[PDB]
Tab-separated table of N, CA and C in Angstrom:
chain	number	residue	atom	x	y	z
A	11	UNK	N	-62.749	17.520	-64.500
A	11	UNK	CA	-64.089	17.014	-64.293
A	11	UNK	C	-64.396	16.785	-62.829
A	12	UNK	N	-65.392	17.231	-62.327
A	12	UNK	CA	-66.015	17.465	-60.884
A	12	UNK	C	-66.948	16.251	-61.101
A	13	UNK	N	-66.463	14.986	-60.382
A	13	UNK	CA	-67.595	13.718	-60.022
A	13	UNK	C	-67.683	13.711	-58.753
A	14	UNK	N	-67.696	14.518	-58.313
A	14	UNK	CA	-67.646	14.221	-56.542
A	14	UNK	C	-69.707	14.074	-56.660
A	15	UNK	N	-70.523	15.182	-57.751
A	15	UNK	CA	-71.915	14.944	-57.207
A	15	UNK	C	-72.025	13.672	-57.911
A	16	UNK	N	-73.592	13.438	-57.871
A	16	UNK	CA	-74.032	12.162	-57.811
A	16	UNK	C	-75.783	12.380	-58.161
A	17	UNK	N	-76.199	11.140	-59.354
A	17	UNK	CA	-77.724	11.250	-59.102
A	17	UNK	C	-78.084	9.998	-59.582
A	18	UNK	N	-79.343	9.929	-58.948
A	18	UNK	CA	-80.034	8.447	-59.047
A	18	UNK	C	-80.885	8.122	-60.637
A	19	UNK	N	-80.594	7.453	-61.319
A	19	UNK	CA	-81.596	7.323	-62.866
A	19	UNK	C	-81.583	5.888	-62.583
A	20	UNK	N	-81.523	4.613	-61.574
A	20	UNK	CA	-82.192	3.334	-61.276
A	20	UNK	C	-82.983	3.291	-60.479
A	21	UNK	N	-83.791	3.344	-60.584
A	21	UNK	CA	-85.165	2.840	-58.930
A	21	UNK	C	-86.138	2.143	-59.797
A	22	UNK	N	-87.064	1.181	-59.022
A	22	UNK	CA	-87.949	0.088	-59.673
A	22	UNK	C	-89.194	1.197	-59.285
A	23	UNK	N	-89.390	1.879	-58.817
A	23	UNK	CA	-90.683	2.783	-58.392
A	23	UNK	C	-90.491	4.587	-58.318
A	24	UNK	N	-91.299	5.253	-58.828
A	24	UNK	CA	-91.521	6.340	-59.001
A	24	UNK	C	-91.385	6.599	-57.457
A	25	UNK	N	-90.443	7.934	-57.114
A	25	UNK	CA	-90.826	8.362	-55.910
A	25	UNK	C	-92.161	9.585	-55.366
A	26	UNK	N	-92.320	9.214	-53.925
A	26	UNK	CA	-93.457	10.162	-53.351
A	26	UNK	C	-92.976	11.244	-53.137
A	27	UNK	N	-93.573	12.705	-52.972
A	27	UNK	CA	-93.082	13.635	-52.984
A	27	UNK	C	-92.423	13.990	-51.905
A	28	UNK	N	-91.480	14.901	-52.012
A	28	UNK	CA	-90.758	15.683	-50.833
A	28	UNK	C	-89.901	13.844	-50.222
A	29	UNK	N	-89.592	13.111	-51.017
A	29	UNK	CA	-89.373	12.063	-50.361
A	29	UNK	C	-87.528	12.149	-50.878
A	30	UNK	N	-86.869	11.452	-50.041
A	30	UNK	CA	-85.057	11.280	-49.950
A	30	UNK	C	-84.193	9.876	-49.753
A	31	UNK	N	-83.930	9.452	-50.827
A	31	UNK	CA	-83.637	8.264	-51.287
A	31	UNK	C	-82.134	8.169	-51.015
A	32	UNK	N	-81.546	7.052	-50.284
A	32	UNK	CA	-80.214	7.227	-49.877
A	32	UNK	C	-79.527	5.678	-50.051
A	33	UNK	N	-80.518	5.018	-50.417
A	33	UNK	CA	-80.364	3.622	-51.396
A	33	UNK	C	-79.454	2.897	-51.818
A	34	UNK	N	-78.487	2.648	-51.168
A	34	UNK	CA	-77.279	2.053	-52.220
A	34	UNK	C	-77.446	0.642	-52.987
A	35	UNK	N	-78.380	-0.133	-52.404
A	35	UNK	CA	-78.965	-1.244	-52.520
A	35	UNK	C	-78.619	-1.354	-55.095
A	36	UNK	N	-77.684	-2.253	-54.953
A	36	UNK	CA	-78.089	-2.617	-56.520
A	36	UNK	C	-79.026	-2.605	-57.128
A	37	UNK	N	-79.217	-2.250	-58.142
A	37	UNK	CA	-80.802	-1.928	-58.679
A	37	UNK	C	-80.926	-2.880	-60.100
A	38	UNK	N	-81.961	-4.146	-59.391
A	38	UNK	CA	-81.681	-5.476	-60.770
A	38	UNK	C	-82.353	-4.855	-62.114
A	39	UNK	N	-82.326	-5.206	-63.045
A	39	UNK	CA	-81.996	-4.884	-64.240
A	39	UNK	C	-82.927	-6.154	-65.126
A	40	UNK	N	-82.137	-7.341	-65.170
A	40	UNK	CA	-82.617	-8.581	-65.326
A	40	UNK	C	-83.659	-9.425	-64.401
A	41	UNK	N	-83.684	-10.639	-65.076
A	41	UNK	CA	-84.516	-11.522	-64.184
A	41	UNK	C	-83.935	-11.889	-63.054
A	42	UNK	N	-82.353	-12.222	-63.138
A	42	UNK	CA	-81.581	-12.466	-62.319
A	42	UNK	C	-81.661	-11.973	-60.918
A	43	UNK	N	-81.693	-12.031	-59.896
A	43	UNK	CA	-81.011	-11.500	-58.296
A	43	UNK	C	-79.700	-11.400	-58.895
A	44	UNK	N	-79.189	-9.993	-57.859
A	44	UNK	CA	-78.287	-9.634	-57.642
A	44	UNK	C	-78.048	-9.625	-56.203
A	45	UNK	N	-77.423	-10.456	-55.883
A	45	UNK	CA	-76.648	-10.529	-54.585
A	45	UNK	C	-75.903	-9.541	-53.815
A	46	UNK	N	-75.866	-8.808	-54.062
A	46	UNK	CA	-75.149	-7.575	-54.026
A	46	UNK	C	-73.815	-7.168	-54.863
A	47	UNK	N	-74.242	-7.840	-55.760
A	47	UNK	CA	-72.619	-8.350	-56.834
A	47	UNK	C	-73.257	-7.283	-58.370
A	48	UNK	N	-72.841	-6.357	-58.376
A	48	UNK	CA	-73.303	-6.245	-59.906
A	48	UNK	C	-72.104	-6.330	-60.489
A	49	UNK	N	-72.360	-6.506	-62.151
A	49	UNK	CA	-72.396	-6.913	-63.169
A	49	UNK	C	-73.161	-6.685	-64.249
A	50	UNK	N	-73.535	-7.952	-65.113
A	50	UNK	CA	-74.211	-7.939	-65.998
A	50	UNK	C	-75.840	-8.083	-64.911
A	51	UNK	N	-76.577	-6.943	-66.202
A	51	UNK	CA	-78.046	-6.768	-65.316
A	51	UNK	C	-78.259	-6.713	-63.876
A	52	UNK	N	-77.103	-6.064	-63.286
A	52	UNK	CA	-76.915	-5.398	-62.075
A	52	UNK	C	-76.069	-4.331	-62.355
A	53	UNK	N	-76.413	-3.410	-62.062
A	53	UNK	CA	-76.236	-1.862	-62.129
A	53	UNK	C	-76.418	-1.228	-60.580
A	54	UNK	N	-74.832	0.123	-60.525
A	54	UNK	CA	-75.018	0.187	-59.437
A	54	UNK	C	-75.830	1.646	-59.740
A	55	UNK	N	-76.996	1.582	-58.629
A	55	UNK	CA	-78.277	2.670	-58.767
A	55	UNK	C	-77.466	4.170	-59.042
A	56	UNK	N	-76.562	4.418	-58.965
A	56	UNK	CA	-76.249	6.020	-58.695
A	56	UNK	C	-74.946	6.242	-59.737
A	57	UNK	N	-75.346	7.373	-60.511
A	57	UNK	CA	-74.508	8.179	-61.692
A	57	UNK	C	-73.854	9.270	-61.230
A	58	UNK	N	-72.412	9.340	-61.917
A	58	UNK	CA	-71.927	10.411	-61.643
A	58	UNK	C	-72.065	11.462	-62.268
B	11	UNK	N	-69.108	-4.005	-92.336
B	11	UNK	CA	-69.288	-3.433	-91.359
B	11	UNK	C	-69.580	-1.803	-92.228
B	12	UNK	N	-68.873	-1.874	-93.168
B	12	UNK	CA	-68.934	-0.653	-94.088
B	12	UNK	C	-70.435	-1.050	-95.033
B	13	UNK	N	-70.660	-1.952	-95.766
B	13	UNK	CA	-71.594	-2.717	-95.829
B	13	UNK	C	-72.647	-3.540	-95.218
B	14	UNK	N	-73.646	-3.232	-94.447
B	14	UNK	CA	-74.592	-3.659	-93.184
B	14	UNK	C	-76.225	-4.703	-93.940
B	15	UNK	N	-76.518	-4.888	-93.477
B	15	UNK	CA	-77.317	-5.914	-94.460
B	15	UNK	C	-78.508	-5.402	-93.144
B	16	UNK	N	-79.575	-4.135	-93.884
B	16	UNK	CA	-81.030	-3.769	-93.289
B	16	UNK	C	-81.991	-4.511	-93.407
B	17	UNK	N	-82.633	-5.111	-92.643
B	17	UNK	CA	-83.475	-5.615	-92.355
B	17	UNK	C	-84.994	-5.348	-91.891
B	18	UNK	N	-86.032	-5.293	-92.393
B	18	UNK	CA	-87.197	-4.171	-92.346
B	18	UNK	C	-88.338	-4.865	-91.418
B	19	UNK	N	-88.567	-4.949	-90.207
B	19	UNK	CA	-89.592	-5.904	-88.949
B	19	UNK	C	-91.168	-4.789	-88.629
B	20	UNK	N	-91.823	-5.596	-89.067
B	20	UNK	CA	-92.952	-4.857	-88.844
B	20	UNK	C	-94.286	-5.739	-89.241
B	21	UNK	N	-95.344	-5.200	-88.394
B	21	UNK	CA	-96.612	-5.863	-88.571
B	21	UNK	C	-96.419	-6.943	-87.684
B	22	UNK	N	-96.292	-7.446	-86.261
B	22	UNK	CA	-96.062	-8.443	-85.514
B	22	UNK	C	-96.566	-8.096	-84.320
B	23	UNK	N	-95.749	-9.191	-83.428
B	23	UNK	CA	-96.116	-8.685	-81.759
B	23	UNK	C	-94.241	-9.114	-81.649
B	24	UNK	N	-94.082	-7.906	-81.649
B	24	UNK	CA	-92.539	-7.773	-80.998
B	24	UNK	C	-91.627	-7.984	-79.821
B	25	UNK	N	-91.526	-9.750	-79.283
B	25	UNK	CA	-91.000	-10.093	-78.227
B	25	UNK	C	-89.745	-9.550	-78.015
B	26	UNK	N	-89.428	-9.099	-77.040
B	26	UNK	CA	-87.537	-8.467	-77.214
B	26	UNK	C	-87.154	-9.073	-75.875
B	27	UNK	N	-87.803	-9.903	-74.924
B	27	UNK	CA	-87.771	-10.498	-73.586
B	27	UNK	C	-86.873	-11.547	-73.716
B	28	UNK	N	-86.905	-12.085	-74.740
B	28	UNK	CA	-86.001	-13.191	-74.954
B	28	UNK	C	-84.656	-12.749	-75.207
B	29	UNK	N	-84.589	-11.367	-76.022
B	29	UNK	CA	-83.327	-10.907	-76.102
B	29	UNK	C	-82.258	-10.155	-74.963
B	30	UNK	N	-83.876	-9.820	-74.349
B	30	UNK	CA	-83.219	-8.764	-72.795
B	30	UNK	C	-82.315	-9.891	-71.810
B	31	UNK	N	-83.335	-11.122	-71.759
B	31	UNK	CA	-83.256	-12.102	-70.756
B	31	UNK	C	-81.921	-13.205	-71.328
B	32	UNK	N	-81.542	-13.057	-72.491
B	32	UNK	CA	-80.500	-13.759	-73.441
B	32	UNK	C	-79.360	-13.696	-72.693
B	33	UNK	N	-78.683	-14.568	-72.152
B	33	UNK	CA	-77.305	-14.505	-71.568
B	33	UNK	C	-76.080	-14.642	-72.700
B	34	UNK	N	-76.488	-15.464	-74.093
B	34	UNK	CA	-75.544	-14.981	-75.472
B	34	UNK	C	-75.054	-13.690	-75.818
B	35	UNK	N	-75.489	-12.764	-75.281
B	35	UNK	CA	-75.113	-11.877	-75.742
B	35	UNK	C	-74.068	-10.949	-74.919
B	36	UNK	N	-73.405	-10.430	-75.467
B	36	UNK	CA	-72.032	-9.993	-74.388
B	36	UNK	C	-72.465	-8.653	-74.048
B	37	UNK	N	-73.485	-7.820	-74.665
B	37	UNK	CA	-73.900	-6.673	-74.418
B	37	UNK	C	-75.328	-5.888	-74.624
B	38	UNK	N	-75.690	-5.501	-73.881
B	38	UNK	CA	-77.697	-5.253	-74.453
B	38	UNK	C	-77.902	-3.837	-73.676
B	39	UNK	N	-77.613	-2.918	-74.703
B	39	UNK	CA	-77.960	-1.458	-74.111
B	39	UNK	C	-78.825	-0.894	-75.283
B	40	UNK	N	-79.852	0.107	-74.349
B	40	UNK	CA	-80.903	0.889	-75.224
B	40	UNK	C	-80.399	2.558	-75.014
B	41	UNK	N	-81.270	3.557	-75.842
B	41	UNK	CA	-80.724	4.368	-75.956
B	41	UNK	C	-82.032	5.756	-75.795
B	42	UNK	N	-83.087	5.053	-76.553
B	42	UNK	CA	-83.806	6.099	-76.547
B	42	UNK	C	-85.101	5.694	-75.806
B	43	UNK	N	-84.857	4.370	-75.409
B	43	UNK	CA	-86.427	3.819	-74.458
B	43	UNK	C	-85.338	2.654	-73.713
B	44	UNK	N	-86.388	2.684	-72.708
B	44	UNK	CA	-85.921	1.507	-71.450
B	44	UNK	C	-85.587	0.157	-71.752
B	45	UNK	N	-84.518	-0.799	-71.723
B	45	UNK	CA	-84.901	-1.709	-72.149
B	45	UNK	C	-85.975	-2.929	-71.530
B	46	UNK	N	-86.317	-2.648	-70.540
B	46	UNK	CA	-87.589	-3.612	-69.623
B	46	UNK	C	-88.536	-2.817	-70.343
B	47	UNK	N	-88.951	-1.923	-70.886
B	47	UNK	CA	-90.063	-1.150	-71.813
B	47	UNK	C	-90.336	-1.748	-73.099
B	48	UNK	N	-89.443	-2.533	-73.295
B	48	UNK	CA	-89.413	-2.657	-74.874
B	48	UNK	C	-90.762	-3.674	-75.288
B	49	UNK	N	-91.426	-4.500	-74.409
B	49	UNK	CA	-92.193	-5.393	-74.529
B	49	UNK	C	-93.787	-4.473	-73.919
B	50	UNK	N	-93.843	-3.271	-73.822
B	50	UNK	CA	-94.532	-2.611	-73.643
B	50	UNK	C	-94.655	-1.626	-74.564
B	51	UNK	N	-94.262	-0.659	-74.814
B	51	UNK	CA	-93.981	0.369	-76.098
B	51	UNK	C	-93.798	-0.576	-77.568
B	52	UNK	N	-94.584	0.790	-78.140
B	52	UNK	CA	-94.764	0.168	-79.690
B	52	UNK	C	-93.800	1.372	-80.611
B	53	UNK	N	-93.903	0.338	-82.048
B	53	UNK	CA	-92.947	1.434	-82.702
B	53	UNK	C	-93.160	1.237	-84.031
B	54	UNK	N	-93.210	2.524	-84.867
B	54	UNK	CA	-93.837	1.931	-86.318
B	54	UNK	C	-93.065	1.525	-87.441
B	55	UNK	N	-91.768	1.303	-87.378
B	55	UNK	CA	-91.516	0.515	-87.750
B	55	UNK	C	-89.802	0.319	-87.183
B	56	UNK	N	-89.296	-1.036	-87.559
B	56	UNK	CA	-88.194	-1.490	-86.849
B	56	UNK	C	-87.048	-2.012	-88.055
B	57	UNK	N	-86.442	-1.682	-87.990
B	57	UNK	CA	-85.109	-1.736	-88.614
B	57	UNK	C	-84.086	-2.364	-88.154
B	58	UNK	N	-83.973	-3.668	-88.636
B	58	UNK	CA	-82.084	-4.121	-88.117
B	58	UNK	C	-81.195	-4.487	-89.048
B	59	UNK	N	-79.846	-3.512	-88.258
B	59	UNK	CA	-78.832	-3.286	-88.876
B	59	UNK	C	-77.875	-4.266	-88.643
């Protein structure tokens, strides 16, 4: 299995076109803040 | 577990915010819709298993 790529299915906003998202920023989930700690209802933005 | 006891939900206003936002629960994943959607999207009828 080849995980070296990578794609984004968390963002809070639709992107603009021709636009390049490099985001590592946790992507909250819950009501909660995420501190930069995920967990529960913190998810990290990017799939392998 | 072999035996499940269905449950038939319908005709309401379907809060699921309380369940999303529920810290009781050890796990809350959706499958075929978002779960922050769920208090937005409708569905004709609801079933729990």
């Amino acid at each position: 299995g080849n995980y070296n790529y990578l794609y984004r299915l968390f963002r809070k906003s639709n992107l603009k076109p021709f636009e390049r998202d490099i985001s590592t920023e946790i992507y909250q989930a819950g009501s909660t803040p995420c501190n930069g700690v995920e967990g529960f209802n913190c998810y990290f933005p990017l799939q392998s | 577990v072999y035996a499940w006891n269905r449950k038939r939900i319908s005709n309401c206003v379907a809060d699921y915010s309380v369940l999303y936002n529920s810290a009781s629960f050890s796990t809350f994943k959706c499958y075929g819709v978002s779960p922050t959607k769920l208090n937005d999207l409708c569905f004709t009828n609801v079933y729990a298993d």
